[PDB]
Amino acid sequence: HSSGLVADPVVLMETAFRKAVESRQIPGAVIMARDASGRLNYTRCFGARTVRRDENNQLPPLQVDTPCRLASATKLLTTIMALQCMERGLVDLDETVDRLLPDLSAMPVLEGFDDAGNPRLRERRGKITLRHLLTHTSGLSYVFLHPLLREYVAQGHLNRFAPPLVNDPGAEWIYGAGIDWAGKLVERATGLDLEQYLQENICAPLGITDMTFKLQQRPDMLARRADMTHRNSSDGKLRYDDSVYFRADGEECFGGQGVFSSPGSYMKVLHSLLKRDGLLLQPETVDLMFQPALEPRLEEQMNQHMDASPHINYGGPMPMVLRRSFGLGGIIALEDLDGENWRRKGSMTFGGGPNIIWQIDPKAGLCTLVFFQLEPWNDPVCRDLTRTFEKAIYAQYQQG
Template identity: 45%
Template sequence: MADFETSIQQAVDAQEIPGCVLLATNRDGSFKYTKTFGHTSMKSENAKPLQTNTVMWVASCTKLMTSICALQLVERGKLTLDDPVYTHVPELKDFKILQTFDNEGKPFEVRHTKPITLRTLLTHTSGLTYDGMHPKLLAWLAYHGREPSVGAKLLQRFDAPLTFEPGESWMYGSGVDYAGLLIERVSGLTLEEYMRQNLWEPLGIKDMTFQLRSRPDMKKRMADMSVRDEESGKVRYTGARMTYQDADGEEVQDCMGGQGVFTSAEEYIKVLHALLTTDEDEKLLKKETLEEFFTPQLGEGASAAINAVLQDDMVNNAMGGTLKDSKRDWGLGGLLLTEDQPDGKAAGTMIWGGLPNLIWWVDRRTGLCGLYAGQVIPTGDAKCAALDRSFEAGMYEKYEQSGLVNPRF
């Protein structure tokens, strides 16, 4: 057994993770790695061996698919990257910037003067920020007597003010959720319908949905969520409300393009592989669009902001666990590495993941993509991040040993 496999099995045995699904493949499929560890739940009566078709909430892994779909509409002339989005989402025009608070805690807000565009939505430079992640917005919520992210509808849930002028900084937020709404308004379809017609069905994906209640067959295969106990370091079952649920614990009504998809690891890897190879077959995007998709997008202020944020251990773990002294940027679908990495990832690799400690990567130069999939909270968990990093390094080692590395790049 490879070293990383031993480490993961030991973590399962020690109840440090319930389990995980690992998948990796290269461009032509001549290199494939698939392995499952552990069980679907830490609650004994629910526990079954984890499978590649076990259904998970993949959370922000949804963002990559929404970004791809938005770029398809750009290719078709239905959208542009740099025009204001207010024609289709006029609600965003009225969003103000939260600047400060007075002595009584009342927020002071001003109108934004630079336009919110599709490019700023996809790159987290619009000023929109997830309200539970920013100290100012937490204070804003407290002033209004509200809890973070509880609305059943997108426009209810993501109505907090901007935290900076569009285009001038970077902060993770609901921009891609609004890009999903933009897709709906332009196409006349729900985001689920659009993705099914333009992404899932072309890739042969069947087990993927925003509305788990509509797929009882998938719900039966759903893994439970686990939470790490701070004292023991072990994980245990949790029935806590997840952000795909409203305040009453019911599934949200809208398709949340930034966090709403349920699927299995074996289905999601099809998206990653298609992105890896679309420069050859243009199945998802045209070649020129793909180049833009993988081009660093951030200006000076945004670049400084993202690299400052990534100095925090938890945040860095959640965002791929890359070297802190290595400059990172953002493409149109995820975090971009601008330098070669010690584990084998080449400059230009795109990575991202999902809140319950899922991480994916697409390395076009080396010709390798992969996914670590699990269901553990809180996000940025150090143990999951360490196991994922050992898995990724192990994949590059195995790939190099296979002699199948694509010489094109």
């Protein structure tokens, strides 16, 4: 036409999400991207927050303000809370946790079992520090992940705080309860429960009114929450899952998994970190979070473990084989994911069990999130849709 007078990657990506909902591959999704400047403010919602039909045989929509189970996306929130304690001089990242976590310090290491089935417990060697807790290098694991803890529970010997360690601090990178113990350290250092601490130090500075460990105390959030959806392994179909986490909060605030919030409120956290606006942490402390924390020996072992474990895939949509490290808050990419087309070296990421993925990319000046409420973790459809979203957004952002 006439200037001034009266195949898109992003449009194609949005169509892909819409088709995934229409074909019942996913219940719905929320995708968000923000840049440091504020110029990029992209939010899109697709489909439903459940597969359970309401009284009118309708599926309630999944929205930017829908309360969701964050699962392991809670770990970044707890990391920030522990780092605020450090900034306020309540804890040193390299001092022993003995002073605030004598109960964790008293925990033995489970070595194995004797030929009669009796557990073989020994004393932990070396100090556990808050830096070990935040980097998953304390020797703490998870019952569902470790074969020794799996055997220890199956025999009837045992709550994220209860299991013995499986290694000494600094021996190896092991995904586990270290963030739950970092949350407990925050409570001990401040004299507040993690819920009150979260409200005063993460929520209030960002104007967040829907982020809590105590969902049962929020009937407004209960009325609007997503339900969990499960993909059946037998036929790949979507089913309603009555998640125990949506029924009761429990007494303990589990820093590694327990927060419920909306995608919109979670993006406020990511965006504050990307902008280094000082609302949650000093800019120097945010820079520290993105620094590779592992010595060469642990970096090599973590990479060998992850490259060999695509069935676990902590990295979610990141390439299966990549040079990574771990910072304070998530996995750091030590190389560009795909040259100038996608996440850059230095970007940090983590996920939540229901296929939630967050990433902050300081070099590119972008942060993105994808929320699903679909289990199990590492779902191929969610993975592919997340890669498609990120790649389309990076393309549009760089084009100008």
